[PDB]
Amino acid sequence: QPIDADVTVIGSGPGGYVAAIKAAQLGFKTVCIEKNETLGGTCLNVGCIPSKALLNNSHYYHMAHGKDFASRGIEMSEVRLNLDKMMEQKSTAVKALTGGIAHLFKQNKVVHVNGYGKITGKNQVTATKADGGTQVIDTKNILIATGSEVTPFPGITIDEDTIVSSTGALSLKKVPEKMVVIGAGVIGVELGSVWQRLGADVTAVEFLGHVGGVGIDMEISKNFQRILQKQGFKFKLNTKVTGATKKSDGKIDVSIEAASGGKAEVITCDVLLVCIGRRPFTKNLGLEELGIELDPRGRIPVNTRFQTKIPNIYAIGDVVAGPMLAHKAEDEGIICVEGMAGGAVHIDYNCVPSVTYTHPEVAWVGKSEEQLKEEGIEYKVGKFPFAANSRAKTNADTDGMVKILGQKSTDRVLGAHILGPGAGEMVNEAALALEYGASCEDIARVCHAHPTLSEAFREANLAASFGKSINF
Template sequence: MVVGDVSTGTELAIIGAGPGGYVAAIRAGQLDIDVTLVEADSWGGTCLNYGCIPSKAMISATDVGHDADTAEHMGIYADVKVDLGQMVEWKDGVVDQLTGGVEKLCKANGVNLVEGRAEFASEDTLRVVHGGEGQGSETIEFEHAIIATGSRPIEVPGFEYDGEHVLSSRDVLDLEDVPESMVVVGAGYIGMELSTVFAKMGCDVTVVEMLDEVIPGYEDDLTTPVKKRAEELGIDFHFGQRAEEWTEAEDGEGIVVTTEDEDGNTTDFETEKVFVAVGREPVLDTLDLEAIGLEPNEDGRLETDDQTRTDIDHVHAIGDVAPGPMLAHKASKEGQVAAEVVAGEPAGLDYQAVPAAVFTDPEIATVGMTEAEAEEAGFDPVVGTFPLRASGRALTADDAEGFVRIVADEESGFVLGGQMVGPEASELVAEVGLAVEMGATLEDVAATIHTHPTLSETVMEAAENALGRAIHTLNR
């Protein structure tokens, strides 16, 4: 029996329960808004289920094994065995705990949860198709809506994901056995993070990249240590190569990936799997935006103002479908702002201190302005740097590759940004982000007593270096 259409109403309808959508829903519930959250796949979205969380779990697990297996110089000897199936089972347990927490928090804050795929029927109506045979559909009338449908992996022509030979980032995190070899198409942050994971498990990894560098968009001195460490792990790089096609190997063992350079020369790579990691694209094609007269821009996103409103005032867009970097924490902040705007609060977005982190080995993290960006913005920047080889904590952790850099306005001393590469960079960047957000000066950071010995001291030392009075490194 097919269940007929059910019609309900809500003050705020949110499409997508990722880190933007579920945060918006919880904040709306806290503000006593009647809110309905619609999700087509899993609570927590891609980030919690198939991206940020599972990949970091795999990174942590493989780091444990690799560190134990390469610690002879510290007097530690181990014969490490990796059971990928068990590792994935542990990873899935972490994911389940977090996604279950999202569902409980939403319900505790009065959020009405609806499972199904939502599309617009009009400017004030959603149609939700429920999964499963005979489940029917539902019509939801709303006063306000937030689009938070996130993004998906980009497919390369000729490399459609099949989950067996051609893998997406979702597929690669669910493998039960370590492949003997893998070609990774793309040396961006996703490709580099997961290339490192599999190299540390003993997989023979080859990375092919159209451009001539790893992790494009970051300064060379940040990415060079990452490439160096990857090469030490045995990762083989081929730059200036476009992936053209793949075929099954003649002997039936594995596949052959063919690439082409700008001169038309082709190269064949024999491998067991190919993992395509060329980026992500916004998901808007499921929403029937024509029904409400919205159209994505040339980047495939919806233009928004500083209160997350689209061209239709009562329809908001946040996260990967809105302009800006595809970052979970950006989506969460936008979700909070969107909910507060719907509630009539004086909320708005300020992107001057949005951090970004790459969880490679070593990690990269940035926030605010680089020196070049500060100059372009009209500042006279002063820069302080502290090398991790001068950090007692980095040396005692046997991980002293990299540096911390802080950028400030020389006249006022205000901190404008920071860049760092090294262990726990993703954690260290928060202090610089706070400094930018609150308008702190170099003197504020340098005068703050930091615990010794810690990695956080490197931020203080970088500030002191910018002031010309660093103790544990030569001053500029």
């Protein structure tokens, strides 16, 4: 019964399932171990894919129900929401994509073992299926793609009915009247905006005095806040959550206190969303037996080749340090199995972009103005408002700006910050530019098609290199 393999990847997330396909195409005998019953990990089942679907569907409702569609001569009498069908589109997408990973596994001759795998040896990993039937796999190299889980709030138990986590908010059966979201990060802002667009009164509470989560420019974050609040988003900043108490009616009273602690308030909501953070998932893997010591935050330490202290054991994804993003895990999985094949392993996390898929979109790659302030790097600022982009005025989507940060002397593009429409796809152009080591002059002299939103990317680069943009 025990199968032998070359590379055994524990995990079907973005990291694992991509690494599984890649390694198999590289000539390796690969085995993917999945504890859940649907391949895809967090991003496909409970993470990126479902949230983006609801964000799109809600935004389309917001435009119809709002002044937008009427403003373009699309006059409608009755706009109504069938939440069952909106969620049906979410379900249809996730189902097809999960099955795709399965088809891809067979297309690329990857072995799927459904079970809870545990490393039972330097060259041995044992999975436990729910039934109890053993499946031990001995392999030369082991890849840990176990992923992450939701960080629990002290004293607040998520029941996924009235007090939900990221998971529960994605399969809610009714729109809350008032909703309190703990955590003003990417996951929080997105899910809050979804229900706010669907008629909920959404108040978000944050210990920190900024929005948008990790590594967001303050100018970008502040302007993001201003636009969201006008859309109807309520933000309680610099505030610690004292506690949560469920009531007889079924509502949740949320005890709130200032970050200093001076002013306490108790607000009510129909649904409480908890998403203060996510944490690496290293439960029951055997790491303690093998003596791979975790880090204080719980992430598996690895070298630049993504090997653990034990050489033939590798670890990639949310389980290791770095941005807890899906394309990060994807790249880390590819380059890891490519180093096993004999290649070199280099990844600059400065090139890794971060996208908030709201409307307006927020996407950034590189370093914020603040990060450069601390490091001592003097920079020039280039800003082009979307109110001057032709395609944005054409589409009546004049919100936000593109901020390009270039070194005062070398003109190297140090950071790219895009607040506004289509920022999620625009940041991939900045990623390509940063990898090449481009300057602000390089980007400006490349012809960008007219009229496109990407023209703001070029014009902001010009305003940083030359000092003056053409159309502003």
